[PDB]
RNA sequence: AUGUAUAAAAAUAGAGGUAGGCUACUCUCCUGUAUCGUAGAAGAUGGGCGAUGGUUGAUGAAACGGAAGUGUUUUAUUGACUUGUCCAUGAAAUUCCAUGAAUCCAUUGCAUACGACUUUA
RNA sequence: GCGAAACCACAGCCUGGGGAACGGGCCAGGC
RNA sequence: CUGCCGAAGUUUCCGGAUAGCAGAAACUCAGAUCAGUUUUAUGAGUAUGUAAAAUGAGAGUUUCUAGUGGGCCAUUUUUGGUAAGCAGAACUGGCGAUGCGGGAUGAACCGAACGUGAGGUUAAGGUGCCGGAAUGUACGCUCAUCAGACGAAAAGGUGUUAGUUCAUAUGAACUAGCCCUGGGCGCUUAAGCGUACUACCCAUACCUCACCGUCUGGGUUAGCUUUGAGAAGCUCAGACGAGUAGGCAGGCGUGGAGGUUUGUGACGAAGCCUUGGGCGUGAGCCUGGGUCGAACAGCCUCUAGUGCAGAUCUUGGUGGAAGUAGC
RNA sequence: CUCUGAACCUGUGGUAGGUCAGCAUCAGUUUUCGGGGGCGGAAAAAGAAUAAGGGAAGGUGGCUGUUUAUAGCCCUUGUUGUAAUACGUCCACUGGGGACUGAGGACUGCGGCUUGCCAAGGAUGCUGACAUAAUGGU
């Protein structure tokens, strides 16, 4: 449906293949896509299954960061040999965690890629950041530490916004104009 | 084809005569004028156009017979003053005019 | 990739092109002649609308070895007046009811050059109609297919 | 009546852009193992009679007229009755003494000239 | 603030192509906000344009427009087929478009 | 969509037999063309009666008398496989006898990779009595305390703003 | 460019808000087709009434924001705008779409295919 | 300082598959 | 240069004479015959041949005259085989003369056979992204820690899924399916597999139209003010369009000759140059500008030392190797 | 006298071509939404309403067993009825939206209305702007 000039996507609980396919199609549509929390990406299958899949890949440059793992999946779904697919890649920014510039921006999700809406209950799935922890990535511990720090600050902002929202909500019914002409569904 | 007809309440127009509005009434004035050689032909001291008071005279009548009609119903005067525009998330096929 | 035995038979039915259609007289000789070319043709019982609409939109007479459309009753009368056929509804009546002059009425018509079916065929086209395809005898379902080709 | 051209690009000889010794003028490829002769995908087109243009508008210039080569005033007078179908075209070897007299004669005859302003200047 | 925007935003996706053959005469346009072929029927026949800019200025204006018209829907997802007066360049894939509300039948 | 067709057929009369025997069959087919063809397969398969020596005298589609009342249907089939000889009995719960056969054709194709041609349904009978049910799942469906959580439905409108509720 | 408008987290197979004193509450979810914003010659000129508030610009600012803080607020004063409710004029004939250091250098050996290398200078 | 000649369709990273060699041109991947 | 026809690649006797295939001419015919046709029935042994109903097409010649006078693969039939494979013949078409959509790719596989185009609709195959098209619906099966997706392979499984049957809620024996063991990115209540139903994608294929050409069938003179008689013209209609060898027709260009244009030219012939313009399906032709300096062309006919990318071609010029080897 | 659209004055009279656009009314092709109606199907099956009878349930009341209660369900007839709907089929029944084409060039014809008129042997109207750029080409 409606689009935006730049899109920030929260990759928590999103399947790797499903999200990458939607992102790759959006990149070829000229949109600018920024994917945050790339280390919480989920892949269907046992963590043993993906460990050997990555270990087989280890046996070019074998990138270990979860963000570069996601970029590899997106890269394969683009015509990177041509200029059109080259420009699409430069319009994508995959990062782990939520950096400050995208910290205070709305983060949308893709229901077609969400694990809960796409994976059978009880199925074993592995987290990309957790999977990448035993392949060479050594920043998982600190990335989590900033994440809780960001969550505390984000929660404090939400309480301030919620407390402020209570003021307009209380004053919403105070004005008689709301009740007088609420026949329009508003 | 270049008009969207909104479902706003109708306006009383039976009170204003519209027989004078023909094809020739709106027709562009014929490009004429036997300009002799030189002066405006060469020196370019061309004349200018201006709407005659006759068009304004008929116009002054139609709002006289229409303004009370739009004032009778609420918001009509403010409605016609505003200019329609499309906001974010507006789907023309879905939302009704 | 048509075997010569079936190739000859379809030439005797004037079906030299894909999607072409003709009217035949369902008798003993035609029955098992169609059985040879079952994988390559489909057929069925046309109702009144199928015979009427095909004649009106795709009706073309064979006037002096030429494909002349039936845009005038004088075209049919000049070529089938010997058999008391004078108009287009008389041509339709002879075809639909299979009258005594069906051979001349059917042979007067050029084979109906139909278009591809709107909406397409089934997913597999060259399986038999009973098995889930489009080939072979299909009874009254020929009308629903002709309606797609007009 | 509008002139329709089935094609505007010329038919170049195959491999004429790789060698200077092979000219651009169209030559039918006689090679049996040539991809151009067998008309594969991506191979160039060949002159076929299907590209032939409408008979009514054949030889017609984009302005709707047919060129008529003129070498003197006597040639241009032939177009007295055919001035709406033909345009006078003065030959390249006709001198400027005769080009001016052809253009003045073609003016009274109501005949378009395709190259009327050649080898001359003006003096108002 | 609030601009004018008497049009609908749209994107140029690709040409009418098979796997290996392209047809630049027809372009596939995604009118964003339209999600099915039935919804696409509203926008059939509307005037679509590609507004771009060139560094050289003509008549004191640096904006050039290629006009087109939506012909028919394409697929089940509301994408439409548009034919322009000049075939759209291949480099305008993913570029924005403007779908007017005229000609109107509402 | 399958349809239950009642097909009655008999051989053409001849000098040897003045009046022929009448054979009636109930079988499921999408259109009457398939039902007539399948019916001729069974008679040849069974009575060894030639199609060319017989004819179809009556064809009739049968609708469900009580399509608004849930029932249990017992279905017997014959399987043509690599071995080419098998027979199984299955039970399904639904409201339409045709619906059971469509569901029946689903599980054989899903499990045994079977086809429509191979299966020849001998008999379909409604099992009204609860005790006669031989299948545990139907028995579980017949308890007075039927109440279970929702099976997951895994439902353009891309880029949702908020996390979906994905709950009751 | 054409509103280049929107910051919880979290489960989902339950969560959040709301409230009482983690134990007992309640309500909402079932997406954003939401919310904010939006009227004026793209938005004129005055008269107002009514807010006497709101919308903000301008600078003078302090606080917060490491991560990639580079932006969030708090304002202080002033400048205007205000369609909040109304009026009086004005914008058109375009009279049917086109819009100063460093290097080389000398020195240098601490170095060794060659520069490089290495201080001094 | 004076100064050739052989040779010269064009080219010049790999990995596989591509049935006829196919790798140097082709197809999917890396560079 | 264009257009129209167009094989055979092999019977048979034996390098061949035949024939076949493909054309030319003259004949006689549509009230006559014919067919990689289907029947009917007679017989004979489900088939068989013969004789006489349907369907389609107007048919039969006679004469002489080019080329072919290899096979590959595939289908079926096959006889023996025999580590197993396979081999051997025969049967039949396709390619060989043939592009196009799909098949990742590929010459044998699936569709489809070709004038130039606009629009529509499909085939085969497809619709997560690369990629045009449903991250469609409704059921199920599958968890792999090598699935799947496109021979050790038999079987085993404290492996499942549905389970059936038999024993007394359980257990045993079994019934199958799938897994384990024995094009890319990625997918796992699928973007896997099986079934059913809608929608959608696009070939040179199909339909409608326009245009080109060919073939075929007509019309057209007391040449009527419709004037449209270069009768070698004009005009109407329908069908058709791959193509090697080969057959046939019409055109483009070059040197010279007869005739002609009461032809072009120092106010600039010919030639050459040009991201100038135009005409023709094409060979080619016309033209603007620049350069240039003395001749030259269109039309009818005649004529020939008449058209080049190749011949380890001939002559001349000139390059990269190379400022290299080197002296 | 006639003629010279003959020169000029006076006309301030009229009528005004090429490229690109917009719309309307049509014709050919096509695609996509509807509305109404006839007929067929067990003259749909259901079902509601509905006067009864019988039965059992995964059992209401009474009390797992039980039989309409202090809920009801199933079967059969009856039932309004000539029901409705779905599906199939048909209408020379009708209302919109979109796209691509405009070949031909006096009149002939076949038809429909009422000499004339017409959607009937192939596109014409009404406008503009730019033209002195757009349209194109290289």
UniProtKB/Swiss-Prot annotation, chain A:
GO terms for molecular function: mRNA binding; structural constituent of ribosome. SUPFAM superfamilies: Ribosomal protein L13. It comes from the Eukaryota. Pfam families: Ribosomal_L13. Its main location: cytoplasm. Keywords: Cytoplasm, Phosphoprotein, Ribonucleoprotein, Ribosomal protein. Belongs to the universal ribosomal protein uL13 family. HAMAP family: Ribosomal_uL13. There are 3 genes for uL13 in S.pombe. Component of the ribosome, a large ribonucleoprotein complex responsible for the synthesis of proteins in the cell. The small ribosomal subunit (SSU) binds messenger RNAs (mRNAs) and translates the encoded message by selecting cognate aminoacyl-transfer RNA (tRNA) molecules. The large subunit (LSU) contains the ribosomal catalytic site termed the peptidyl transferase center (PTC), which catalyzes the formation of peptide bonds, thereby polymerizing the amino acids delivered by tRNAs into a polypeptide chain. This is Large ribosomal subunit protein uL13B. The lineage of its organism: Eukaryota, Fungi, Dikarya, Ascomycota, Taphrinomycotina. The gene is rpl1601.
UniProtKB/Swiss-Prot annotation, chain B:
It is found in: Cytoplasm; Nucleus; Nucleus, Nucleolus. The modification Phosphoserine is found at residues 7, 17. Disulfide bonds: none annotated. Component of the large ribosomal subunit (LSU). Mature yeast ribosomes consist of a small (40S) and a large (60S) subunit. The 40S small subunit contains 1 molecule of ribosomal RNA (18S rRNA) and at least 33 different proteins. The large 60S subunit contains 3 rRNA molecules (25S, 5.8S and 5S rRNA) and at least 46 different proteins. Component of the ribosome, a large ribonucleoprotein complex responsible for the synthesis of proteins in the cell. The small ribosomal subunit (SSU) binds messenger RNAs (mRNAs) and translates the encoded message by selecting cognate aminoacyl-transfer RNA (tRNA) molecules. The large subunit (LSU) contains the ribosomal catalytic site termed the peptidyl transferase center (PTC), which catalyzes the formation of peptide bonds, thereby polymerizing the amino acids delivered by tRNAs into a polypeptide chain. Belongs to the eukaryotic ribosomal protein eL6 family. This is Large ribosomal subunit protein eL6. It comes from Schizosaccharomyces pombe (strain 972 / ATCC 24843) (Fission yeast). The gene is rpl6. The chain holds residues 99 to 195 of 195 of the full protein.
From Swiss-Prot, chain D:
GO terms for cellular component: cytosol; cytosolic large ribosomal subunit; nucleus; preribosome. One of its GO terms (biological process) is cytoplasmic translation. It is found in: Cytoplasm; Nucleus. Disulfide bonds: none annotated. The modification Phosphoserine is found at residue 74. InterPro entries: Ribosomal_eL32 (IPR001515), Ribosomal_eL32_CS (IPR018263), Ribosomal_eL32_sf (IPR036351). GO terms for molecular function: structural constituent of ribosome. Keywords: Cytoplasm, Nucleus, Phosphoprotein, Ribonucleoprotein, Ribosomal protein. CDD domains: Ribosomal_L32_L32e. There are 2 genes for eL32 in S.pombe. Component of the ribosome, a large ribonucleoprotein complex responsible for the synthesis of proteins in the cell. The small ribosomal subunit (SSU) binds messenger RNAs (mRNAs) and translates the encoded message by selecting cognate aminoacyl-transfer RNA (tRNA) molecules. The large subunit (LSU) contains the ribosomal catalytic site termed the peptidyl transferase center (PTC), which catalyzes the formation of peptide bonds, thereby polymerizing the amino acids delivered by tRNAs into a polypeptide chain. Component of the large ribosomal subunit (LSU). Mature yeast ribosomes consist of a small (40S) and a large (60S) subunit. The 40S small subunit contains 1 molecule of ribosomal RNA (18S rRNA) and at least 33 different proteins. The large 60S subunit contains 3 rRNA molecules (25S, 5.8S and 5S rRNA) and at least 46 different proteins. This is Large ribosomal subunit protein eL32A.
Swiss-Prot record, chain E:
The modification Phosphoserine is found at residue 96. It comes from the Eukaryota. It is found in: Cytoplasm. Its main location: cytoplasm. Belongs to the eukaryotic ribosomal protein eL33 family. Component of the large ribosomal subunit (LSU). Mature yeast ribosomes consist of a small (40S) and a large (60S) subunit. The 40S small subunit contains 1 molecule of ribosomal RNA (18S rRNA) and at least 33 different proteins. The large 60S subunit contains 3 rRNA molecules (25S, 5.8S and 5S rRNA) and at least 46 different proteins. Component of the ribosome, a large ribonucleoprotein complex responsible for the synthesis of proteins in the cell. The small ribosomal subunit (SSU) binds messenger RNAs (mRNAs) and translates the encoded message by selecting cognate aminoacyl-transfer RNA (tRNA) molecules. The large subunit (LSU) contains the ribosomal catalytic site termed the peptidyl transferase center (PTC), which catalyzes the formation of peptide bonds, thereby polymerizing the amino acids delivered by tRNAs into a polypeptide chain. This is Large ribosomal subunit protein eL33B. It comes from Schizosaccharomyces pombe (strain 972 / ATCC 24843).
